[PDB]
Amino acid sequence: PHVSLIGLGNMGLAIANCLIKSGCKLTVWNRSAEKAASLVPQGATVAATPAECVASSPTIVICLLNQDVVQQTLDEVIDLSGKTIINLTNGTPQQAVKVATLVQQRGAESYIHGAIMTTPEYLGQPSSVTLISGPKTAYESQKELLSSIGTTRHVSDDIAKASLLDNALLSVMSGVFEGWVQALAIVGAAGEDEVDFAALASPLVASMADQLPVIAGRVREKQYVGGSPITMGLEALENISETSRELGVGVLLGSMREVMSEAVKKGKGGESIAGLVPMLTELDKKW
Amino acid sequence: MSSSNKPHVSLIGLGNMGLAIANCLIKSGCKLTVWNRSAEKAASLVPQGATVAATPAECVASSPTIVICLLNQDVVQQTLDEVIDLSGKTIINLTNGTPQQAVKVATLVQQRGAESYIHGAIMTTPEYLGQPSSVTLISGPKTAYESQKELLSSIGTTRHVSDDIAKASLLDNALLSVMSGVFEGWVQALAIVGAAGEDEVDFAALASPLVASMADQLPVIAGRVREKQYVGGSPITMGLEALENISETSRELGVGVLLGSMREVMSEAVKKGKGGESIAGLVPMLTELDKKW
Numbered sequence: 001p002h003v004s005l006i007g008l009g010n011m012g013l014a015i016a017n018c019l020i021k022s023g024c025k026l027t028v029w030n031r032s033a034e035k036a037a038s039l040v041p042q043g044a045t046v047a048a049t050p051a052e053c054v055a056s057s058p059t060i061v062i063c064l065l066n067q068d069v070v071q072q073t074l075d076e077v078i079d080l081s082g083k084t085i086i087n088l089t090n091g092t093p094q095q096a097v098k099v100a101t102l103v104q105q106r107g108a109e110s111y112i113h114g115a116i117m118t119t120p121e122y123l124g125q126p127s128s129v130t131l132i133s134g135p136k137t138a139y140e141s142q143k144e145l146l147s148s149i150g151t152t153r154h155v156s157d158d159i160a161k162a163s164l165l166d167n168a169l170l171s172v173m174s175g176v177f178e179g180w181v182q183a184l185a186i187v188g189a190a191g192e193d194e195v196d197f198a199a200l201a202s203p204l205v206a207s208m209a210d211q212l213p214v215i216a217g218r219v220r221e222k223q224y225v226g227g228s229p230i231t232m233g234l235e236a237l238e239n240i241s242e243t244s245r246e247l248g249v250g251v252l253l254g255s256m257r258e259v260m261s262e263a264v265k266k267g268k269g270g271e272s273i274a275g276l277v278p279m280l281t282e283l284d285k286k287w
Numbered sequence: 288m289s290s291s292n293k294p295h296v297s298l299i300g301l302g303n304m305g306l307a308i309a310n311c312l313i314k315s316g317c318k319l320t321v322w323n324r325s326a327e328k329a330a331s332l333v334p335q336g337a338t339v340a341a342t343p344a345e346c347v348a349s350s351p352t353i354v355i356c357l358l359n360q361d362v363v364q365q366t367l368d369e370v371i372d373l374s375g376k377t378i379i380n381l382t383n384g385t386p387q388q389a390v391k392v393a394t395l396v397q398q399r400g401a402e403s404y405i406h407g408a409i410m411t412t413p414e415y416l417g418q419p420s421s422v423t424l425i426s427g428p429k430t431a432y433e434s435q436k437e438l439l440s441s442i443g444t445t446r447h448v449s450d451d452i453a454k455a456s457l458l459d460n461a462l463l464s465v466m467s468g469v470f471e472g473w474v475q476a477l478a479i480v481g482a483a484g485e486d487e488v489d490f491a492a493l494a495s496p497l498v499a500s501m502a503d504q505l506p507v508i509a510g511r512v513r514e515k516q517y518v519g520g521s522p523i524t525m526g527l528e529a530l531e532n533i534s535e536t537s538r539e540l541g542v543g544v545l546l547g548s549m550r551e552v553m554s555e556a557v558k559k560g561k562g563g564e565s566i567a568g569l570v571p572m573l574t575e576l577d578k579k580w
């Protein structure tokens with residue numbers, strides 16, 4: 001089986017290693033071609049140009065910095081007739097739309113998008129899940145090949161859905177990390193032990209697994225009443241900022257304060273955090 | 288309360304949590320004296336055997352043990368203003384506030400001659416108060432904690448975290464930081480999903496695993512922070528680009544964007560040459576500088 005990979009960054013090299021381990025004949029291209037150095041002894045062929053790399057195989061795996069770079073790399077690649085593109089470059093839903101439209105206008109058989117939900121060092125383990133979006137029949141053709149990078153989950157036939165879902169999941173993760181950095185800064189500056197604190201904290205974050213579905217149900221049915229009030233949540237954030245200032249510690253969660261303050265001004269002070277969702281869906285604003 | 292001879296307890300504050308505390312103390316058999324600015328919120332406790340005191344001073348005179356649960360530590364100070372004498376009184380403050388607000392209140396009651404001050408951080412909502420699964424952190428003199436343990440079992444399970452009165456507030460604010468970030472992320476995720484036409488409940492099924500995962504990831508990061516091991520983990524540069532992807536996903540959908548303070552501190556990290564470090568490397572950027580991000 002002939003497979004081409006475009007991009008040999010930390011994730012690209014991890015993908016290259018997984019595909020070699022799968023037993024495929026691998027053709028690779030990278031802007032910095034010397035990053036293929038470790039793949040040549042495994043039997044990988046180095047293509048001079050994107051165009052050449054694409055010519056070598058009917059299945060093209062892409063893992064570059066961003067979808068802007070993907071479009072620039074595909075720029076001169078004019079002939080994709082017969083080619084299946086597997087794009088594992090993270091980006092936005094509409095970025096995936098523009099790339100899928102570009103390759104399909106140039107002949108591509110299909111486009112499927114993958115969001116890898118792990119780091120390079122765990123790629124290829126069954127516990128490592130990649131969300132896949134695009135035509136079912138294209139997923140089914142590529143499922144065996146894709147197993148080389150871990151567990152695939154077909155989320156939708158719409159190519160833009162892996163990026164939509166992965167961006168949603170990264171919001172949650174980003175939120176968790178913002179609160180956690182703030183917590184550890186406070187605990188550290190107070191002379192407390194970060195590991196002991198995690199022993200106390202990590203359990204209560206476990207708990208959220210239970211509460212996040214409840215909040216999600218309330219949001220769908222637009223039931224914004226029921227649960228700790230937004231006024232209470234905003235006071236909490238004011239105690240966090242001042243607990244921090246007392247210790248000379250800086251504070252995150254500014255956007256959360258700003259949106260909750262405006263909610264109170266709009267008279268939603270007595271609603272639960274479910275009532276913050278329409279604050280976002282209704283207005284294009286960076287809080 | 289195990290004795291047929293029911294002890295006298297005073298309660299200052301009858302908001303949602305104060306009224307939950309009242310019902311816990313009445314249900315445990317206490318002889319309860321209450322005060323509230325809005326006196327009529329006591330009305331539901333009177334047919335249960337609660338006495339309503341005219342003033343905070345009268346309330347404090349009625350019991351050797353005073354439980355306080357008010358809006359904030361400033362209202363606590365305002366309410367103790369005309370209380371002259373706390374001789375032989377134990378003060379149990381369940382009002383949320385900062386570490387130094389607890390210090391400032393602990394000096395108000397000490398100056399009045401209070402026997403002791405302990406602080407409690409209730410880690411649940413009023414409806415779950417009194418279930419043994421409901422945990423309150425207590426900080427203050429371990430001997431005062433020990434004496435008040437049976438009385439405190441009325442509101443559920445207590446955990447003595449420290450002899451320092453400021454610690455319950457320190458730890459609770461640190462815990463509320465984590466929860467605030469979780470909720471900020473969740474509201475952003477739900478807004479993107481909703482605006483795209485996807486099913487919030489279906490998404491919760493997909494995403495509830497990831498938050499459970501953080502049972503493991505968080506103690507890993509804590510360890511890294513304590514050893515100042517900032518290298519190892521997905522780098523801040525990749526974190527920052529995921530935030531730019533999130534901002535632009537939201538913009539495509541006409542949806543607003545939270546996580547600004549995170550975007551700002553991670554950008555500065557990059558400028559300062561810490562782009563290759565994990566999230567652990569952001570902790571020293573907070574501890575080094577009194578700034579709002």
Ligand SMILES: NC(=O)c1ccc[n+]([C@@H]2O[C@H](COP(=O)([O-])OP(=O)(O)OC[C@H]3O[C@@H](n4cnc5c(N)ncnc54)[C@H](OP(=O)(O)O)[C@@H]3O)[C@@H](O)[C@H]2O)c1
Pocket residue numbers: 007008009010011012030031032033035063064065066069072073088089090091116117118119120521525
């Ligand atoms: N933990 C992770 O790393 C992780 C996890 C999940 C998904 N991903 C995603 O996987 C993708 C790649 O990640 P990575 O960690 O491999 O990033 P990386 O190590 O920075 O690699 C960047 C890749 O993009 C190429 N590149 C950058 N600018 C270019 C340009 N102007 N023209 C041509 N090529 C260019 C690089 O080529 P050079 O080698 O010549 O610089 C390299 O192949 C990203 O979308 C990322 O979001 C990463």
Ligand SMILES: NC(=O)c1ccc[n+]([C@@H]2O[C@H](COP(=O)([O-])OP(=O)(O)OC[C@H]3O[C@@H](n4cnc5c(N)ncnc54)[C@H](OP(=O)(O)O)[C@@H]3O)[C@@H](O)[C@H]2O)c1
Pocket residue numbers: 228232300301302303304305306323324325326328356357358359362365366381382383384409410411412413
């Ligand atoms: N989920 C929760 O509700 C929860 C969970 C854990 C901890 N807590 C903590 O418990 C405390 C009270 O919360 P809550 O839910 O009871 O709030 P609440 O329902 O708003 O109760 C506020 C209380 O403070 C009193 N108050 C406000 N301003 C005052 C003033 N200027 N002078 C005198 N009294 C004043 C109110 O008097 P009136 O009745 O006359 O208005 C009422 O007794 C807070 O520190 C909170 O963080 C709450």
